Amino acid sequence: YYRTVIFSAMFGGYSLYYFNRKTFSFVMPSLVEEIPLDKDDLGFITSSQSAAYAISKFVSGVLSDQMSARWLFSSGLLLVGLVNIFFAWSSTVPVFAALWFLNGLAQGLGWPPCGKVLRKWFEPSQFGTWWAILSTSMNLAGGLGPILATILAQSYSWRSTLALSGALCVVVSFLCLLLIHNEPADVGLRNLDSTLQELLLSPYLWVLSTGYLVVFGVKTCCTDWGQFFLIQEKGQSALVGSSYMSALEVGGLVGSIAAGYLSDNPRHGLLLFMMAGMTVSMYLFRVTVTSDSPKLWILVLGAVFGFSSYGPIALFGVIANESAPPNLCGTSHAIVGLMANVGGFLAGLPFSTIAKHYSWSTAFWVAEVICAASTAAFFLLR
Numbered sequence: 367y368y369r370t371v372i373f374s375a376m377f378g379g380y381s382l383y384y385f386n387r388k389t390f391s392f393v394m395p396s397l398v399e400e401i402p403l404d405k406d407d408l409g410f411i412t413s414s415q416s417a418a419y420a421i422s423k424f425v426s427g428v429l430s431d432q433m434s435a436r437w438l439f440s441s442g443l444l445l446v447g448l449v450n451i452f453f454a455w456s457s458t459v460p461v462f463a464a465l466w467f468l469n470g471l472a473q474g475l476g477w478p479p480c481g482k483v484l485r486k487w488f489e490p491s492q493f494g495t496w497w498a499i500l501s502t503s504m505n506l507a508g509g510l511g512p513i514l515a516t517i518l519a520q521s522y523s524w525r526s527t528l529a530l531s532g533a534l535c536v537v538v539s540f541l542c543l544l545l546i547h548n549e550p551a552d553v554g555l556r557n558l559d560s561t562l563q564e565l566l567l568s569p570y571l572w573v574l575s576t577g578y579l580v581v582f583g584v585k586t587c588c589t590d591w592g593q594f595f596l597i598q599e600k601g602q603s604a605l606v607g608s609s610y611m612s613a614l615e616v617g618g619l620v621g622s623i624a625a626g627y628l629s630d631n632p633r634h635g636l637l638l639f640m641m642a643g644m645t646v647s648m649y650l651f652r653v654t655v656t657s658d659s660p661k662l663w664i665l666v667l668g669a670v671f672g673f674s675s676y677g678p679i680a681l682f683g684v685i686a687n688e689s690a691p692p693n694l695c696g697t698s699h700a701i702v703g704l705m706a707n708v709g710g711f712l713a714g715l716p717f718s719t720i721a722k723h724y725s726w727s728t729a730f731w732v733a734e735v736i737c738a739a740s741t742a743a744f745f746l747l748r
């Protein structure tokens with residue numbers, strides 16, 4: 367009962383976080399077709415997102431210890447709602463970047479509160495499977511996102527499918543003020559149960575962190591820019607690219623679910639085969655797609671990318687728990703997430719700068735060669 371509500375008001379709550387952390391990506395074609403923006407401008411917006419999400423992710427890991435988790439989750443969800451409402455009324459790129467920077471700060475203040483809630487309602491042996499099911503909320507939101515964004519944006523507006531999402535997040539924030547609970551002892555339901563500088567100077571954390579940097583950077587490149595690659599170079603329509611995002615996130619659902627079965631260091635080999643599959647799938651996506659190339663192929667390549675991108679994200683999370691000491695394990699996850707969103711910042715603005723200064727094909731060549739160089743450098747370290 368309480369563990370059903372505590373996970374349905376969050377799985378349906380954090381999907382209205384990830385549906386709005388990528389809602390600039392979901393209505394990217396209408397935003398570019400209506401008003402002209404630089405690719406540096408779009409990369410500047412999504413890099414303000416990634417930098418703000420880095421800073422707020424790293425500070426909210428301490429704010430979970432200082433401050434409660436239902437209050438930060440509800441307040442950040444209401445802030446995301448107000449941000450997207452003002453983002454639909456706004457029209458120019460500096461205020462786009464400012465409101466999307468506030469969206470990055472708001473998105474950072476909500477996911478470690480989900481960590482504190484799910485850490486204090488389930489057994490510590492069952493942290494992993496409920497974390498995986500809550501991490502499939504990103505795949506669910508990004509799977510149902512761009513299809514709705516295209517089928518509503520062609521019919522009404524991008525501003526209308528931002529205002530509806532903002533109002534929905536305000537309504538579910540007023541719901542999450544009252545649905546979830548931070549501590550079961552507040553309602554009385556039988557509550558259950560330096561070395562830092564060595565951890566910053568431990569080599570396995572840096573290898574894990576640059577690996578999750580390059581995996582989250584390649585995933586952020588391919589997610590936030592693959593549909594735009596298909597529209598502006600490969601001649602696909604906006605529907606094909608939005609369905610490519612959707613097939614990427616359906617493949618990510620299958621990946622982050624079947625990263626739990628296939629894990630149960632022998633996990634490192636599964637992880638490296640899966641990153642090699644990511645590099646080979648992105649090479650096929652850079653070469654083999656064509657105007658004459660069918661839609662079913664590009665959905666299969668999206669699914670094979672997602673099965674090989676969110677898969678190593680889930681395995682990197684599992685290894686980042688297992689390599690962390692139990693006294694200050696949240697600091698290790700904060701360092702890993704900070705390097706992840708440094709990878710997201712590298713995926714936002716310098717990637718689009720490489721895109722508009724050489725080519726989109728050269729941009730995905732840069733992303734494919736840094737993913738291939740990382741997979742080759744990780745085939746050598748083991």
Ligand SMILES: O=C(/C=C(/c1ccccc1)n1cnc2ncccc21)O[C@@H]1C[C@](OC[C@@H]2C[C@@H]2c2ccc(Cl)cc2)(C(=O)O)C[C@@H](O)[C@H]1O
Binds near residue numbers: 702
């Ligand atoms: O958090 C993990 C993995 C585990 C884990 C537990 C058991 C087996 C294998 C892995 N984990 C650590 N603390 C946890 N507390 C509750 C539930 C799971 C917890 O990976 C991290 C996931 C990652 O950061 C999320 C930040 C920690 C907070 C959070 C938010 C929501 C939740 Cl549900 C949990 C924690 C992200 O999703 O962006 C990226 C990187 O930081 C990874 O390292």
